[PDB]
Design an enzyme around this catalytic site. Structure first.
Site, PDB file in Angstrom:
ATOM      1  N   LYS A  74       0.823  -1.198   0.000  1.00  0.00           N
ATOM      2  CA  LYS A  74       0.000   0.000   0.000  1.00  0.00           C
ATOM      3  C   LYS A  74       0.858   1.250   0.000  1.00  0.00           C
ATOM      4  O   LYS A  74       0.577   2.191  -0.738  1.00  0.00           O
ATOM      5  CB  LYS A  74      -0.925  -0.021   1.208  1.00  0.00           C
ATOM      6  CG  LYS A  74      -1.788   1.188   1.381  1.00  0.00           C
ATOM      7  CD  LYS A  74      -2.693   0.975   2.566  1.00  0.00           C
ATOM      8  CE  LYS A  74      -3.557   2.172   2.826  1.00  0.00           C
ATOM      9  NZ  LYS A  74      -2.734   3.299   3.310  1.00  0.00           N
ATOM     10  N   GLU A 101      -3.265   7.898  12.782  1.00  0.00           N
ATOM     11  CA  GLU A 101      -2.373   6.785  12.515  1.00  0.00           C
ATOM     12  C   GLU A 101      -1.489   6.527  13.728  1.00  0.00           C
ATOM     13  O   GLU A 101      -1.250   7.422  14.538  1.00  0.00           O
ATOM     14  CB  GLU A 101      -1.542   7.086  11.265  1.00  0.00           C
ATOM     15  CG  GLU A 101      -0.573   6.003  10.769  1.00  0.00           C
ATOM     16  CD  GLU A 101      -1.212   4.637  10.550  1.00  0.00           C
ATOM     17  OE1 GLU A 101      -1.352   3.863  11.518  1.00  0.00           O
ATOM     18  OE2 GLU A 101      -1.548   4.316   9.394  1.00  0.00           O
ATOM     19  N   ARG A 102      -1.061   5.275  13.888  1.00  0.00           N
ATOM     20  CA  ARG A 102      -0.060   4.956  14.891  1.00  0.00           C
ATOM     21  C   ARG A 102       1.249   5.654  14.564  1.00  0.00           C
ATOM     22  O   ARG A 102       1.588   5.870  13.402  1.00  0.00           O
ATOM     23  CB  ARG A 102       0.184   3.456  14.959  1.00  0.00           C
ATOM     24  CG  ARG A 102      -1.005   2.580  14.716  1.00  0.00           C
ATOM     25  CD  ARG A 102      -0.514   1.218  14.288  1.00  0.00           C
ATOM     26  NE  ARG A 102      -1.514   0.167  14.393  1.00  0.00           N
ATOM     27  CZ  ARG A 102      -2.459  -0.068  13.495  1.00  0.00           C
ATOM     28  NH1 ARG A 102      -2.549   0.677  12.411  1.00  0.00           N
ATOM     29  NH2 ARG A 102      -3.314  -1.058  13.676  1.00  0.00           N
TER      30      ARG A 102
END
Lengths: 538, 71, 50, 71
Positions: A153, A179-180
């Protein structure tokens, strides 16, 4: 000019004796550890505004001075943000100095009105074969990316960034909504490694602005960071006149963050559990992604589907806005095909002959029908036999087996670790290439001729090299010398070549340690405010 | 477009405008009904007017019923 | 007989997949309705106190 | 136990202690993270910490969301 009245979690009430700030206006809490920005959510009456914090509210005192900035959250925009990382309120979190602001724009904005919209509905050529043919991207449309982990991705993200900057000369914004931080740092270093983000003096040649609102940020900061990425993209659209790419990483986390800030402001949740304003809180973001008369914003939004349930209201509300899906599959990636776009589950609204023409439409539908026809006989090949059925059925097997190879393509940001040079493929070359494989002009070329190549005048050179490779095999032999004593020693020699590392039983841990003494007594403040023991009577 | 009125309360617009836009278009087409002519009215996604009205009702703190809808 | 059974259990997995898909859709409806109704119960309990 | 800390907020302890035990244990393990060494934190039943936080927030009359939980 205003002072803190209530602090309930991330939700702060501020009281203004003068005039109130507007809703969505930004307020600075004067005097705090870090910069604490609040965003006005509603006017509660009795000269109180209700605000939602963009950082932690721990350490906040009722009566703390709060300065109204007179505007919403204002972020630096321009070419000086390229290759930088911003948080929601515009501060650089990449630790590389300030941000060279061309302008300072409000993140809150109405959608481009009806007279400014484009009625054209044209295709965004992306240079990726499977994306340009089967699931084209609308210039100004929203594209759902159903990828995940290990399907390539991030390579597809960086290649859309690379190919859009290379072809159309537009810049990209990546909005990492929720997001992390490990994944966000991985994407940052992978963008530095692939050359789409450059550090130092070459910073102007970066193609991407990262806008990161991390997962440990409060819900108000995750709910607004997509608008910050939108504002950075809207500057490039409206002032620079470009075809911008916006990447909203996990649009579902945008939905979930706005649901959290709607729950914290005491609103009754709607269906399944979501905010009552779910369609309008999503449409306020997605309607600013459009084509204006100046330029466009094309949005590639990763979509998470909550319980593998497409009728859940967050993906059912998102899918109303989407113009294409590109489903990345693990089964496509375990045939070594890259990019791992599922050629049959990816859809596009741009796939009808009134926007792409009957030539492109019929080539795409023929390719999709041929791959479908191969797909629903693999339980007939694996059960009854490979050469069991007809030759025409094995003709579709061979044609779809080489089209399924031909959708793969080497990527330009992948060449720094794969060696194979990436190949931008144009649209008319893609149409003329897949039409030839569909009619059968390349039924004589091998299946590995159609693998990791740009266009149709490279599968020929691939087969030409593969048939020069027949004559390069009689140059040598195959053998492995010295069956037991080439380099394989006695096992005592192999343990007497490994070097012993130093192990100590004093583990240490008193290296730069304060070692304060903690009182066992409970120490309180008296009415003057000084540290005092507890008064020892209830 | 010589014969069409086009009323639009799009996704960016407020939920009161999306709740009210079919009534606005119906009042515009009832002009042709009431003066002897014939009208055609298309409410595209009345399922979105219901969602905008559900938003207005839950923001008015009215009790939700089935699926969350106001009753 | 063996080939007729191979063609008969081919339609049985087709039927047990389409029945499974209908049942999965109806389960998703019941899951969504369960979360909504429990949420409406909790909100009505809290609003009768505040 | 030469390398393990145990932070134990049991069932009889108050709900704010069960809420604050993972944060306190993470503060103890961030000493090893921050000074060069390596940590391993295990929040056993973060489910029960979640239930304790839901208890404190429903008793503080913060608005409940899904299943009863806060925003």
């Amino acid at each position: 000019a205003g002072y803190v009245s209530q602090v309930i979690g991330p939700v702060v009430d501020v009281r203004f004796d003068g005039e109130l700030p507007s809703i969505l206006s930004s307020l600075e809490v004067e005097g705090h550890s870090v910069r604490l920005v609040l965003e006005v959510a509603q006017h509660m009456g009795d000269n109180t505004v209700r605000c939602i914090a963009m950082d932690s509210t721990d350490g906040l005192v009722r009566g703390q001075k709060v300065v109204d900035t007179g505007s919403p959250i204002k972020v630096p925009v321009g070419r000086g943000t390229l290759g930088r990382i911003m948080n929601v309120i515009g501060e650089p979190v990449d630790e590389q100095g300030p941000i060279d602001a061309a302008d300072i724009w409000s993140i809150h904005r109405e959608a481009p009105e009806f007279t400014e919209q484009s009625t054209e509905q044209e295709i965004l050529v992306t240079g990726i074969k499977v994306v340009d043919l089967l699931a084209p991207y609308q210039r100004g449309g929203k594209i759902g990316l159903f990828g995940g982990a290990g399907v390539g991705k991030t390579v597809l993200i960086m290649e859309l960034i690379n190919n859009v900057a290379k072809a159309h000369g537009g810049f990209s914004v990546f909005a990492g909504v929720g997001e992390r931080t490990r994944e966000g740092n991985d994407l940052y270093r992978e963008m530095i490694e692939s050359g789409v983000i450059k550090l130092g003096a070459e910073r102007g040649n970066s193609k991407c602005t990262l806008v990161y609102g991390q997962m440990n940020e409060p819900p108000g900061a995750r709910a607004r960071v997509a608008l910050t990425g939108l504002t950075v993209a809207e500057y490039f659209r409206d002032i620079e006149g470009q075809d911008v790419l916006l990447f909203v990483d996990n649009i579902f986390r945008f939905t979930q963050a706005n649901s959290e800030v709607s729950a914290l402001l005491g609103r009754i949740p709607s269906a399944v559990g979501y905010q009552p304003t779910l369609a309008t809180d999503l449409g306020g973001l997605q309607e600013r992604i459009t084509t204006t008369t100046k330029g466009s914003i094309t949005s590639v939004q990763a979509v998470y589907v909550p319980a593998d349930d497409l009728t859940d209201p967050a993906p059912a509300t998102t899918f109303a806005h989407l113009d294409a899906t590109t489903v990345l599959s693990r089964s496509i990636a375990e045939l070594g095909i890259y990019p791992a776009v599922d050629p049959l589950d990816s859809t596009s609204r741009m796939l009808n002959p009134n926007v792409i023409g009957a030539e492109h439409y019929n080539v795409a539908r023929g390719v999709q029908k041929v791959l479908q026809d191969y797909k629903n006989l693999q339980d007939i090949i694996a059960i009854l036999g490979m050469d069991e059925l007809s030759e025409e059925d094995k003709l579709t097997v061979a044609r779809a087996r080489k089209i399924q190879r031909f959708l793969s393509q080497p990527f330009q940001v992948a060449e720094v670790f794969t060696g194979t040079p990436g190949k931008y493929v144009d649209l008319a070359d893609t149409i003329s290439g897949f039409q030839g494989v569909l009619t059968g002009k390349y039924d004589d070329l091998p299946e590995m001729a159609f693998y990791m190549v740009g266009d149709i005048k490279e599968v020929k050179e691939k087969a030409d090299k593969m048939a020069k490779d027949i004559a390069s095999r009689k140059e040598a032999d195959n053998k492995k010398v010295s069956e037991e004593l080439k380099d394989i020693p006695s096992l005592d020699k192999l343990v007497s070549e490994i070097k012993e590392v130093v192990i100590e039983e004093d583990d240490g841990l008193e290296e730069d340690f304060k070692a304060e003494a903690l009182s066992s007594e409970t120490v309180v403040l008296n009415e003057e405010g000084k540290s005092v023991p507890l008064p020892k009577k209830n | 477009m010589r014969y069409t009125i086009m009323v639009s309360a799009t996704a960016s617009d407020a939920a009161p405008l999306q709740f009210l836009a079919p009534y606005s278009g119906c009042a515009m087409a009832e002009y042709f009904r009431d003066t002897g002519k014939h009208g055609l009215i298309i409410y595209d996604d009345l399922s979105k007017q219901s969602v905008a009205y559900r938003q207005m009702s839950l923001l008015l703190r009215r009790p939700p019923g089935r699926e969350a809808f106001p009753g | 007989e063996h080939a007729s059974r191979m063609s008969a259990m081919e339609n049985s997995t087709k039927s047990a997949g389409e029945m499974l898909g209908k049942l999965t859709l109806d389960y998703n409806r019941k899951r969504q309705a369960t979360i909504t109704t429990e949420l409406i119960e909790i909100i009505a309990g809290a609003s009768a106190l505040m």
